[model samples]
Target: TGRAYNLTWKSTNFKTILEWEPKSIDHVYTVQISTRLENWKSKCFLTAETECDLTDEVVKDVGQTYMARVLSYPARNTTGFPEEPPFRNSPEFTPYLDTNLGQPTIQSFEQVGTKLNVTVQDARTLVTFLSLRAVFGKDLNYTLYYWRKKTATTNTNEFLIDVDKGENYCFSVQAVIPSRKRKQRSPESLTECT
Candidate 1:
């Protein structure tokens, strides 16, 4: 009747941990990541840590989309087995992997009313989204932003963002193809701006 569960990615490496903040700290949690077309029985885990890793299997399957789910068993009602379902489960997610896809071309931009409007394009047709990373504040660290626009048929897309005029943050865009499946990106565009 009502929505309640969620999952958040922590970090990635040969081993990675994924988590969903369960209602209680002591509840048993079972986690699983999807691979292949169908699972023989589906792989999972029961652990005390908020995030659990399936070891290097995910690393091998990098560039492909994977679905991970976390099932919560209430401390008072620990009724589910690792192979069975629980009281709550997390939704599927498109985890990130350093894609080989080329970066998008930042055709141009304009600063209008504290917002930066940008245009980007990718050669590959399956790009479903774009990752824009650059400085947005006075700080040196780059803040990441994502823009979603289907490009299987269209080759270019334009996006707008609100920014601080005083700070100098130029934007760069990267094209993202299908998760787990990719066509490709090149280096930073020839054009750069402040």
Candidate 2:
């Protein structure tokens, strides 16, 4: 089975979310970001570490689309190399729009190992997942993700809280079990104040 991946882009005006399962892990994966599909054919906004989360600064351009994917490595680590390890490439997917168009608001987010503190609300409860939305301009996008224990097993579940920076984003949470259907949430604004 392939590894799991999540892609998101958000701004004051628009949002986009993409999630998928990987196919292989034989080389360094390229997480390319682009506006036009044609440009993505020859570009990568930023690459990510195959085994962990890597964040890149938000790049917003009006009337442009953004794309990201996992691909095999451009080069493999040598057998004798101790500092560098062999990495796998991710499959390239079709590019999408960077729908937001206002001023970039979510400057940066910090990660403590696997946990990302978004600092949006004081409390968040969930049975499925939590996501954070930030803006770069009028272009809209979303980063769809959930939190799990760093060392979770099939027998255990990780129910961690995430912080969002969107001061005026609609908020809602849902519950989903192993054998249940997906549910939609009512529109509720997420808080950004302490």
Candidate 3:
């Protein structure tokens, strides 16, 4: 009689995690994952934990859509095949489409006369081998927000901009994904002053 409810995917920076409500007391839960072109593959089998980390399972094809379901069975049921247990399905998710972009770090900035050149560190993703830039490729862009002390803020997609030669300006950077149906923007970085 144990069933999982409110099965949701909480993903950020391509780190995929499935979380469900109500910890198992008399029963346990098992998680199965599937992609559009593949059969269901058992992930977390008969575990008491309410959350499952699926980063590696879905990261293989970040652009492909995947689905997951949690099945609940009585604690004594070691082999889940004899009887079917109640299950809850998660919404379809594509790592590249649904994952939240993280804030970009401002590595360093150089001011040359009235022109300012800022260098940014790409946002880190769950996949250590690839950054957000590598995943989104040409579709990825960075928005820089900068202003002189006590001055109105201005934002531009370009990293280099013209600013007052001697004025100290504070800046923050955010990653933008314009290719998505609804534009996605990452959290702003910590402010850094020239």
Quick one: best TM-score, which candidate? Answer: 3
lDDT of 1 by residue, 6-99 (tens): 5755442223456666446556666666655645223455555666654444544344566666665544323344434453444443334432
Over 4 Å off, model 2: 1-19, 23-26, 41-58, 74-186, 190-194
Q: Give the TM-score of candidate 1.
A: 0.37
Model 3 residue runs over 4 Å out of place are: 76-82, 149-158
- As for lDDT, the candidate ahead, 2 or 3, is 3
> In order, what lDDT does every prediction score?
0.46, 0.31, 0.80
lDDT of 3 by residue, 1-194 (tens): 56788889898788879999788678888899998799989989999899999988887888899999999878753655667678998989988889887767888888898988888765666545556666677777777777772322223334777888888888788777778875387888899888
lDDT: worst 10-residue window of model 2: 148-157
True-vs-predicted CA distance for residue 41, candidate 2, Å: 8.8
Judged by lDDT relative to the true structure, which candidate is superior, 1 or 2? 1
lDDT of 2 at 186: 19
Clashing residue pairs, backbone N/CA/C < 3 A, model 1: 63-180, 64-180, 65-180, 101-184, 101-185, 102-184, 102-185, 102-186, 103-185
Q: Please, what are the lDDT tens digits per residue for candidate 2 over residues 1-194?
A: 13335433322222333333344444335444444434444243223443322222123332343445554443323456444322223333222222222222222344454444332221211212212222212222222233321111121112233444432222222211222122111122232222
